[PDB]
């Protein structure tokens, strides 16, 4: 008896929230933006090529200083780059080649990276010794780390192949809240600008939002087909974008509790691997299986430009925190910085 | 360019020098997946060849370094982490021949052999491994040669010759797996019947790797 009653109550509540979402859906962002001036062609050009990695780049992240960027590769090397002058500021030998993810702290003191060893290794850049070394290995994940984001120098949130995210105290080296509500394994994180909320995407094509202290999912967004590879918050924090193997990108608004826009064009047949907004929020930048980045007017959903410069799968994007540039990483082993 | 920026460019060239000297090492290693249908004799070949998350093992044999990635600890969705291994020289794959009349513990409906065929087809015909050869160990040789006297191979397959002698049964397992390869021109399956002497199992990896690398070189040269 009871399991079928609870399954009918799950069906009833799923039906109630889709009706509640469709009730507050009084317009579309395409209608609301009918009057605005379009972006026009975003002809960005490669101002640097960072050309020291010897295998596929899997992740990169900017410092808050918006001049340094970390990147990681299958070479088992993570590099911090001076993006202004192409210098390798540091290169870090990882304990493992298999770097699915990296992140760089809001103060630039620390770097994190994950992998197919489920450990998040955290590296102290600003030691009194001149070599970068590990602070913690955050071992308690059951599947590969897909994403990392520092809230601050002593708290990181991670997401994994085990269908969980976790928030760690980096001092004691242990989970503090742990987040389990997905059913597919989890592929991407983004923090809200206030870093109290975050949102993560999984292979069930649900994106779920959390509060890091409440320890529990507030909202579930599920407009995607297939599987979500990529997430970014829109810079106001009230919305986020998602990139899938369903070749569309999608913009979800938290207060609307649902999908606003769907960025697809009929000749992008292939997965989005990474996403970022530009500083105003006006451009989505999205990285693809088909070897380039597309650039989208995030309000109109027209394709505003292309970052064509890669000879293998773009696996990363990041717009600098000052908005000045976009780095792109790819499986061709070069980063290219565009403005 | 300032006195500090000249020293920072130097540092960057020092990083590059050593970062490239590490590539000169990492390109000389041979990179191998190791795959198998759960507990499948995989751990036995790992200890023979040496004597959380993925386990990576190192060996050198006849003056050639191998890196072998036992990925079997990643229980989750291969579609989102197997693309790491696109640069692998050869997959090593394991099947315990004893699995023909054992059944899969999560439902007890499907034979462990059919579960390992689902995995072999799944890795073999996948887009990242299209040029990547598979070494295929067939692991628990002795226990299969004993058990087939007690339990005929038709308990696995609706279709078989019904011969049930060890040699034609074992060669029918090999035939049933090599028939899963949808691209026999781009990749060759190197099947081996695993044996008690460590160096015989290692020599087969060295042979199949050397032959894969020669067939890759001949495909570069235009001799193929």
């Amino acid at each position, epitope marked *: 008896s009871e399991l079928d009653q609870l399954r009918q109550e799950a069906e009833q509540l799923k039906n109630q929230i889709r009706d509640a979402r469709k009730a507050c859906a009084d317009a579309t962002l395409s209608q609301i933006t009918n009057n605005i001036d379009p972006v026009g062609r975003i002809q960005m050009r490669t101002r640097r090529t960072l050309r020291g990695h010897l295998a596929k780049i899997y992740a990169m992240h900017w410092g808050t*200083d918006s*001049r*340094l960027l970390v990147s990681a590769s299958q070479d088992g090397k993570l590099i911090i780059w*001076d993006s*202004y002058t192409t*210098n390798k*500021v*540091h290169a870090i030998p990882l304990r493992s080649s298999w770097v699915m993810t990296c992140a760089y702290a809001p103060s*630039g003191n620390y770097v994190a990276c994950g992998g197919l060893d489920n450990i998040c290794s955290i590296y102290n850049l*600003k030691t*009194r*010794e*001149g*070599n970068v070394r590990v602070s913690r290995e955050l071992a308690g994940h059951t599947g590969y780390l897909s994403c990392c984001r520092f809230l601050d120098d002593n708290q990181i949130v991670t997401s994994s192949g085990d269908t969980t995210c976790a928030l760690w105290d980096i001092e004691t080296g242990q989970q503090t809240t742990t987040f389990t509500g997905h059913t597919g394994d989890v592929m991407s994180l983004s923090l809200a600008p206030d870093t109290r909320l975050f949102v993560s995407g999984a292979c069930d094509a649900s994106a779920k939002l959390w509060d890091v202290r409440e320890g529990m999912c507030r909202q579930t967004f599920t407009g995607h087909e297939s599987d979500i590879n990529a997430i970014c918050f829109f810079p106001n924090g009230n919305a986020f974008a998602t990139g899938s193997d369903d070749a569309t990108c999608r913009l979800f608004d938290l207060r609307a509790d649902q999908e606003l826009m769907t960025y697809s064009h009929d000749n992008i047949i292939c997965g989005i691997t990474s996403v970022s907004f530009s500083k105003s929020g006006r451009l989505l930048l999205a990285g693809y299986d088909d070897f380039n980045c597309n650039v989208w007017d995030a309000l109109k959903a027209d394709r505003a430009g292309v970052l064509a410069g890669h000879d293998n799968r773009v696996s990363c994007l990041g717009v600098t925190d000052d908005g000045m540039a976009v780095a792109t990483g790819s499986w061709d082993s070069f980063l290219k910085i565009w403005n | 360019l*300032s*006195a*500090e*920026d*000249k*020293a*920072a460019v*130097e*540092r960057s*060239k*020092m990083i590059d*020098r050593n970062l490239r000297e590490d590539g000169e090492k990492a390109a000389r290693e041979v990179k191998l997946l190791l795959l198998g249908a759960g507990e499948s004799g995989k751990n036995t070949i790992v200890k023979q060849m040496k004597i959380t998350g993925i386990v990576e093992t190192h060996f050198t044999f006849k003056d050639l370094h191998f890196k072998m990635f036992d990925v079997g600890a990643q229980r989750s969705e291969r579609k989102k982490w197997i693309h790491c291994f696109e640069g692998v020289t050869a997959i090593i794959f394991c099947v315990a021949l004893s699995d023909y009349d054992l059944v899969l513990a999560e439902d007890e409906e499907m034979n462990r052999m059919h579960a390992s065929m689902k995995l072999f087809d799944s890795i073999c015909n996948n887009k990242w491994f299209t040029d990547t050869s598979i070494i295929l160990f067939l692991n628990k040789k002795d226990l299969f040669e004993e058990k087939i006297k007690k339990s005929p191979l038709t308990i696995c397959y609706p279709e078989y010759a019904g011969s049930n002698t060890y040699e034609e049964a074992a060669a029918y397992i090999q035939c049933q797996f090599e028939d899963l390869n949808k691209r026999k021109d781009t990749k060759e399956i190197y099947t081996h019947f695993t044996c008690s002497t460590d160096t015989k199992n290692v020599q087969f990896v060295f042979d199949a790797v050397t032959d894969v690398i020669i067939k890759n070189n001949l495909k570069d040269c235009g001799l193929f």
Partner: single-chain antibody, 233 residues
Framework: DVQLVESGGGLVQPGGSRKLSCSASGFAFSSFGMHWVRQAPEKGLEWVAYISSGSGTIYYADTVKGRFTISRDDPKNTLFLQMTSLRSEDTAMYYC??????????????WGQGTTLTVSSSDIVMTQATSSVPVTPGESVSISCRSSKSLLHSNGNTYLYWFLQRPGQSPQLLIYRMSNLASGVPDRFSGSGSGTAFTLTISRLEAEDVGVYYCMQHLEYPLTFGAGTKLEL
């Protein structure tokens, strides 16, 4: 702790020879550029020589160019300075000094305790507003320094370093460019400037702020210190 210890030298005859040695320990020495700096008895600092991290990019001051050779052995974490035709003008305490160069780094951040050497018997001039000032704890002080060239470089960062040498100590970095404090330095100190003239302010002195303060420039080799202002209790 990070350490720089200097088996060094002692007495020599003038026109003689000596090998200064500086064994580093407790840090990744192979990655640091190493300087030597010196200090004649009751005088200001002179930069002497440099090696970068890769053992390339050696430099010297014109007072020692060709007479001294600077050398390193990274497998022993050791730096050397081999001294030939030692003049009476080479009588000084010599400090081995580490430096590391990358964006946001603090070079000159740790100094060896120093070796005496003693003898029997074209660049930016840096200068400071006085020989000394009188002080007491809880006051505020604004030390000042002047450069014979603009130290504000086209890349935007300004190569004024500030050091404190406490009585009988080896020097310590306070501030690495005009305004960036070192690690291990308290929030009392704060530097600023126009690009040719500069200040180090100490916001609320403590008795540990007694000592001699040197500005230095790092825009060009040869590196040049001011003759340091004493703060006197």
């Amino acid at each position: 702790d990070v350490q720089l210890v200097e088996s060094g030298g002692g007495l020599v005859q003038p026109g003689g020879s000596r090998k200064l040695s500086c064994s580093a320990s407790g840090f990744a020495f192979s990655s640091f550029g190493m300087h030597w700096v010196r200090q004649a008895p009751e005088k200001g600092l002179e930069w002497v020589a440099y090696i970068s991290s890769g053992s390339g990019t050696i430099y010297y001051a014109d007072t020692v160019k060709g007479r001294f050779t600077i050398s390193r052995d990274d497998p022993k974490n050791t730096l050397f300075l081999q001294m030939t035709s030692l003049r009476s003008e080479d009588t000084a305490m010599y400090y081995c000094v580490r430096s590391i160069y990358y964006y946001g780094s603090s070079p000159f951040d740790f100094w060896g305790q120093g070796t005496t050497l003693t003898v029997s018997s074209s660049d930016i001039v840096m200068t400071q507003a006085t020989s000394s000032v009188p002080v007491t704890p809880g006051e505020s002080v604004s030390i000042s320094c002047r450069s014979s060239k603009s130290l504000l470089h086209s890349n935007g960062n300004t190569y004024l370093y500030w050091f404190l040498q406490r009585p009988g100590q080896s020097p310590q970095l306070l501030i690495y460019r005009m305004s960036n404090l070192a690690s291990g330095v308290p929030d009392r100190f704060s530097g600023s400037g126009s690009g040719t003239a500069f200040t180090l302010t100490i916001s609320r002195l403590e008795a540990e702020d007694v000592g001699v303060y040197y500005c230095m420039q790092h825009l060009e080799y040869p590196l040049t210190f001011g003759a340091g202002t004493k703060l006197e209790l």
